[PDB]
Amino acid sequence: PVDFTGYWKMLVNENFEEYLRALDVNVALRKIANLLKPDKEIVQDGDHMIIRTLSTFRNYIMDFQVGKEFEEDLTGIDDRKCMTTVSWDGDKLQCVQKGEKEGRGWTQWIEGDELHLEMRVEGVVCKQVFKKVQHHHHH
């Protein structure tokens, strides 16, 4: 069992530039984006997941049911549209984002007080780790 509910602060963000390059993000937007250290606010409510990614530049929200394909109209910093399914794989969440790019998806899991997120596209891998935190602010 796992419960992702909580507020999480970015600790590391590895190889994000290459990932954004694979998504054709203008080198200019790559500089903006790799300086951001977003927080994640997650509510796991049964198999209904809400994952908010919160930064000083843009907020994102993923709102889905585990196992149910959905249209992800604002998938990431590249703002492509994907048909996305997030499934359980044991205690990991496995996401496939079907769309214009091959092999796009991510895997999310918890180790201790760390939220681990591996993002993939076209063979490129970016790894993020967040730490669970308790000081909350309105958004």
Side-chain angles (χ1 to χ4, degrees), residues 1-30 32-136 139:
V2 70
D3 190 338
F4 292 100
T5 300
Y7 195 62
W8 304 91
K9 189 162 187 172
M10 179 172 280
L11 187 75
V12 299
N13 184 12
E14 182 180 27
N15 205 35
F16 194 49
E17 162 85 10
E18 189 183 27
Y19 176 84
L20 293 183
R21 181 165 75 95
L23 293 178
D24 313 294
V25 167
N26 290 331
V27 196
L29 180 50
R30 266 145 65 183
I32 290 166
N34 185 239
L35 300 169
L36 301 177
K37 304 299 176 187
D39 302 321
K40 301 250 179 200
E41 184 194 85
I42 302 174
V43 182
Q44 177 174 325
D45 185 10
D47 271 348
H48 179 199
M49 291 284 186
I50 299 168
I51 302 173
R52 297 186 64 186
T53 304
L54 303 163
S55 84
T56 58
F57 171 66
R58 192 183 284 180
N59 293 342
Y60 300 85
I61 179 161
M62 280 192 95
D63 185 336
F64 60 89
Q65 189 77 11
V66 184
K68 174 181 187 61
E69 186 173 63
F70 66 100
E71 188 178 348
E72 192 178 2
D73 263 357
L74 305 163
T75 58
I77 291 156
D78 71 336
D79 56 74
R80 286 186 173 84
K81 301 181 191 171
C82 289
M83 293 307 304
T84 298
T85 307
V86 184
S87 302
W88 288 115
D89 174 14
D91 293 337
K92 306 182 185 299
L93 278 176
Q94 299 285 5
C95 176
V96 179
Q97 293 166 308
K98 298 173 165 125
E100 292 153 304
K101 306 296 284 188
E102 187 279 334
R104 193 181 181 154
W106 50 253
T107 307
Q108 185 173 278
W109 71 99
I110 284 172
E111 303 181 16
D113 69 352
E114 295 166 0
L115 178 75
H116 287 252
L117 177 62
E118 181 183 275
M119 297 170 70
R120 299 172 297 270
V121 69
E122 311 240 336
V124 177
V125 183
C126 163
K127 179 64 194 298
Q128 302 182 343
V129 185
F130 302 75
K131 286 283 194 170
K132 208 173 192 285
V133 289
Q134 312 301 328
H135 193 257
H136 190 253
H139 296 269

